[PDB]
Design a protein around this ligand. Structure first.
Ligand SMILES: *[C@@H]1O[C@H](CO)[C@@H](O)[C@H](O)[C@H]1NC(C)=O
Ligand SMILES: *[C@@H]1O[C@H](CO)[C@@H](O)[C@H](O)[C@H]1NC(C)=O
Ligand SMILES: *[C@@H]1O[C@H](CO)[C@@H](O)[C@H](O)[C@H]1NC(C)=O
Ligand SMILES: *[C@@H]1O[C@H](CO)[C@@H](O)[C@H](O)[C@H]1NC(C)=O
Ligand SMILES: *[C@@H]1O[C@H](CO)[C@@H](O)[C@H](O)[C@H]1NC(C)=O
Ligand SMILES: *[C@@H]1O[C@H](CO)[C@@H](O)[C@H](O)[C@H]1NC(C)=O
Lengths: 110, 53, 175, 218, 213, 175, 175, 112
């Protein structure tokens, strides 16, 4: 016979991707996909296109009451969620108890 | 900032369609599930065997 | 390998084949080179893509705010709220880790099955006109030109056409 | 199901480069293919990418210029072509291999919405409207000439007159600018009874024109 | 590579007729041919893939078949909706080539064009350029010859032709021939004619005007 | 197919066989017809039924009222209650969809394995007394009556009994 | 068996082999005995141990007190708390039962594949120098001493060395 | 990762017996091997146990005296040797077969 051989084989590359299986850990594969999200843009954004409501120097109690260390919205405003930094202190400047604070915060969230 | 998003976390928004995330368990909006997993790599190709020997 | 083809009787892969996952290395007087089996490669890509799409698309969610705020006299519901979040975290993490672990094993065996099937498909086409020589390789007892080569890749090899040519060569190599 | 929303129309000059977006409504890993149709010509597949096999297969004509890429997390496909030339002035489409069977590589399946791309040395030029005064039935119209780029929106009497209205396709003249003609047939009696005004709108140049097509009298 | 050759190049029917479009390949593509329908100003739609397997949402009237090198797409009864251009694309090997194109038209009785002419306006003449417009309204068939006769001398290269798509009400076409000349050459002549030779007209129809009147 | 039998080297199924999942088509002088392998069919039905029973019976529940009623000043616990219901909905939907998707793949391969095993069981019984001719078919070199036929279905074929009869016929067909 | 080796063409196991999961029974003039294939046995133990470790180690928990105390006027949150506990109980029970059920099936097939691969590895080494006689057994046409025996266990059998010795014996047993 | 914490040092007289503990920080089913090093001498593998294959493989020198065992729930390994003699005065180590590949039987991997 004049040689004339034919071979069956599979593909290989230089990829260093390693995956974990039930029977063996760190198996190198030619191609793989990542199912986990671990990166964030590091900025609070506009959910549903509507910008959030930012308070800053005040908590929700300060802004809703009108503490002199807080701003107010004169025009018709809208928001998708509320941002309240932990540095916010200027809320109920006069000491006292604000009833249903957590309930009102949730109702004012959007 | 002034860019739209469909998911928001205190550490920052995410623009992803993957079903899992591990950035922050507290999210607002249409967001993937939060897991403690470190590496979820799904193999699509076959075992790489380029070794000459 | 579950089917014994990948890392089995085919010891290693081919870096010279870059156009597909599974294929062939041919050799004749016209030369030699690598080619990928279009039929088996595309049918494996579709399954893997469906596999990836199935994992992702079946996860459909809606708008939801996880954050809940409680005061210092609402510890029990706060602990109840935390118990809900932690329980979901453990359930999702365990399922996600095991899903990848089990499906990664399935995917590698899927490639193993496809390689094994391709070898057997060629084996059924050639029958005794070729000699198995290991490493997933066949030696032809008759001359096979470029038209004859791709005819195996086509899937249209003519066994009776070279049956008598190969049979005469079969009984002379073995003394 | 997933829906494909391509990027908006963009106009550039020869020698530049452009990248086209293709966002998925949900999340999928189906293959990506980009197809171009030139004005008056047939479809032409440009290239493709397999998310699970990596790589990026292009055509012989487009290999070297085009660069098709996709991102997994956003499920968004990108098609970039460099060394832009007047030959590439066309509309580009984004498709994903998907049928009821599944991934079904090879078949375009779900398509996008198209993306008009215009390449020419001409800059943004406002349209000029000249009234074609009318002479059974009579025909009067407006002439939108030497504008860039496409398109121009032409109506009649602020959309009051629609039957018999024929807005002709634009023509690329020898100057690299577009010219358009809009006509409508009305009964000869209402020539003086009703005044006819055409409303040509070309937002790329922020130009909106209302021309009174007065009857011509010798 | 593979050369997809669609036959016929163009066709026409009158709703409810049996339609058959043939697509030929240079090499053998087994059964990796797919049929697509393209509409003016709308995204292309897949109908038949792998020579069979009607896409979800496509009505059963669209039926495809064939293998090897010759393929065929059939529509049982033609409707108003499926009046569009059809393309056959191979996916057997890269590059994936489409067909040349096969347009479908709604059949109509032969209708003579109504020819109108528009001399350049006095407002436009003030700009130093003149545009003479010849209009053909609601005619059939699409094929027509428009000749510009400037002082009985045939102007060539100075005119451009624009044709609208078929109207949805009467299934007719409209044509616009714009012969553009500068104000200098426009006033060099006094008579401008638009000779239209069309099937619906027994003889060519000429509409002319005299400059300055 | 994972094992390459169903839709593999056996191209199509038999509608003439209605009494079972896997079986045989015989041909001799006494006639021809379809018959189902009782042993392999019943052993596959039991596995599938156990598979269906396992999915259903392992789900055991108790009496429970999902409905909870809250007032307008109990939004947070109401949101907490909704968060519990929605989280359970997403978890159950994803597991149920993936369970069917993965188990449906397993079931089809299970039928593929059984078909392949049945062919190999017959192959081991006949050895060189029969010639493989593709499509999961065997050609006998010796005459095989109805008793000989079902003896293969029984699983009691006598290779030495027809060994010399088939060997003489083996060396004459091939010139 | 999925691969048809365990409880398939190898009807029963060996209690005389206690040093491993898969191995060999040899027979020659020097005697007979059982030996275990070290390579295939250890590679199966590692996979199973990884399988057990994967199920256990991926479950990572933290300090948590399940107990919650409510009064007689907090029935709704108490029912909400109970609904959380019962929902977690049903989810974990169903996943745990199905995980064992599916993985137990996978483990048995994994042993089936390994047994089948080991037989085929020996088959590829011997080629026509040995005759398949069923029950996963080979008969040598040439004498094979202890060095020749373990050379198969080593994986270093010399086919050309005994090719002519076995070929002469091959054509005399068959008349 | 898992961490191995062996039992404390113990001193006895000839003829007695001793069992050594090996607690895992987490839970794992990796194999167990015990190795002894005598003062001024080299290392010496004593025995091993495979949690998934059962059994307990020892060395020729130690077979009969040593008894290596492990418990699954606590993931704790135990090495007991009887008929203590002055020759066994040494330091004993507990190791688990584990690398990045996985179970990797044969290699000591993590030590105590
Ligand atoms: C978000 O989307 C809205 C759509 O209504 C749009 O008006 C707004 O400009 C977008 N914000 C961005 C892109 O930052
Ligand atoms: C099979 O391959 C040969 C090799 O050139 C060719 O002659 C023949 O056309 C091929 N058949 C196809 C492509 O269907
Ligand atoms: C299967 O096809 C049907 C239409 O025939 C469609 O409704 C369904 O979504 C398809 N399956 C998948 C998983 O898309
Ligand atoms: C095997 O099949 C033959 C066919 O008739 C029959 O003679 C014999 O009794 C069968 N053996 C059984 C049923 O055990
Ligand atoms: C193979 O086995 C034989 C049997 O004794 C022996 O001579 C030879 O050294 C072995 N090869 C090894 C152990 O590598
Ligand atoms: C794989 O190896 C890496 C180090 O190369 C390690 O970080 C990882 O944990 C290993 N995989 C497993 C499952 O232990």
């Amino acid at each position: 016979d004049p040689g004339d051989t034919l071979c069956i084989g599979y593909h290989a590359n230089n990829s260093t991707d390693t995956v974990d299986t039930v029977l063996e850990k760190n198996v190198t594969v030619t191609h793989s996909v990542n199912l986990l999200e671990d990166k964030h843009n590091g900025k609070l954004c506009k959910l549903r296109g509507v910008a959030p409501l930012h308070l800053g120097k005040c908590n929700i109690a300060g802004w809703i009451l009108g503490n002199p260390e807080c701003e107010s919205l004169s025009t018709a405003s809208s928001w998708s969620y509320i941002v309240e930094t932990p540095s916010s202190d200027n809320g109920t400047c006069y000491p006292g108890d604000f009833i249903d604070y957590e309930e009102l915060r949730e109702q004012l969230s959007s | 900032h002034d860019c739209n998003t469909t998911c928001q976390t205190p550490k920052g928004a995410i623009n992803t369609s993957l079903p899992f995330q591990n950035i922050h368990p507290i999210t607002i909006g249409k967001c993937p599930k939060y897991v403690k997993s470190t590496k979820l790599r799904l193999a699509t190709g076959l075992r790489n065997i380029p070794s000459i020997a | 390998g579950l089917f014994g083809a990948i890392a089995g009787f085919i010891e290693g892969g081919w870096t010279g084949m870059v156009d597909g996952w599974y294929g062939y290395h041919h050799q004749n007087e016209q030369g030699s080179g690598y080619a990928a089996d279009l039929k088996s490669t595309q049918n494996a890509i579709d399954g893997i893509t469906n596999k990836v799409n199935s994992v992702i698309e079946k996860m459909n969610t809606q708008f939801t705010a996880v954050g809940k705020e409680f005061n210092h006299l609402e510890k029990r519901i706060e602990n109840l709220n935390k118990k809900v979040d932690d329980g979901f975290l453990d359930i999702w993490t365990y399922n996600a880790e095991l899903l990848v672990l089990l499906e990664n094993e399935r995917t590698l065996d899927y490639h193993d099955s496809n390689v094994k099937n391709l070898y057997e498909k060629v084996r059924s086409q050639l029958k005794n006109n070729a000699k198995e020589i290991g490493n997933g390789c066949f030696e032809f007892y008759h001359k096979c030109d470029n038209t004859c080569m791709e005819s195996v890749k086509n899937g249209t090899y003519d066994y009776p056409k070279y049956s008598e040519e190969a049979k005469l060569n079969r009984e002379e190599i073995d003394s | 199901e997933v829906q494909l929303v391509q990027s908006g129309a963009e106009v550039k000059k020869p020698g530049s480069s452009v990248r086209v977006s293709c966002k998925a409504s949900g999340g999928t890993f189906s293959a990506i293919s980009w197809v171009r149709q030139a004005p008056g010509q047939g479809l032409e597949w440009m290239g493709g990418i397999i998310p699970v096999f990596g790589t990026a297969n292009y055509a012989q004509k487009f290999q070297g210029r085009v660069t098709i890429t996709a991102d997994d997390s956003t499920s968004t496909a990108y098609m970039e072509v460099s060394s832009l030339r007047s030959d590439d002035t066309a509309v580009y489409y984004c498709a994903r291999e998907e049928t009821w069977k599944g991934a079904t590589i090879g078949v375009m399946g779900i398509w996008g919405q198209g993306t008009m791309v215009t390449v020419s040395s001409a800059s943004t030029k406002g349209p000029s409207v000249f009234p074609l005064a009318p002479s059974g039935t009579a025909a009067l119209g407006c002439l939108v000439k030497d504008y860039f780029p496409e398109p121009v929106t032409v109506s009649w009497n602020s959309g009051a007159l629609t039957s018999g209205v024929h807005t002709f396709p634009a023509v690329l003249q020898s100057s690299g600018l577009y010219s358009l003609s809009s006509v409508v047939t009305v009964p000869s009696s209402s020539l003086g009874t009703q005044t006819y005004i055409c409303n040509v709108n070309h937002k790329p140049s922020n130009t909106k024109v209302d021309k009174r097509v007065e009857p011509k009298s010798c | 590579d593979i050369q997809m050759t669609q036959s016929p190049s163009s066709l026409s029917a009158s709703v409810g007729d049996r339609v058959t479009i043939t697509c030929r390949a240079s090499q053998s593509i087994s059964s990796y041919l797919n049929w697509y329908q393209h509409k003016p100003g709308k995204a292309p739609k897949l109908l038949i893939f792998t020579a069979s397997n009607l896409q979800s949402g496509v009505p059963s009237r669209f039926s495809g078949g064939g293998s090897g090198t010759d393929f065929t797409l059939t529509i049982s009864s033609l409707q108003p909706e499926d009046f569009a251009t059809y393309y056959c694309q191979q996916s057997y090997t890269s590059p994936r080539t489409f067909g040349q194109g096969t347009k479908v038209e709604i059949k109509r009785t032969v209708a003579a064009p109504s020819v109108f002419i528009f001399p350049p306006s006095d407002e436009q003449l003030k700009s130093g350029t003149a545009s003479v417009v010849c209009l053909l309204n609601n005619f059939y068939p699409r094929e027509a010859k428009v000749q510009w006769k400037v002082d009985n001398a045939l102007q060539s290269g100075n005119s451009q032709e624009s044709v609208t798509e078929q109207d949805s009400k009467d299934s007719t076409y409209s044509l616009s021939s714009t012969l553009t000349l500068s104000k200098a050459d426009y006033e060099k002549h006094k008579v401008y004619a638009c000779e239209v030779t069309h099937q619906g007209l027994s003889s060519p129809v000429t509409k002319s005007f005299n400059r300055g009147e």
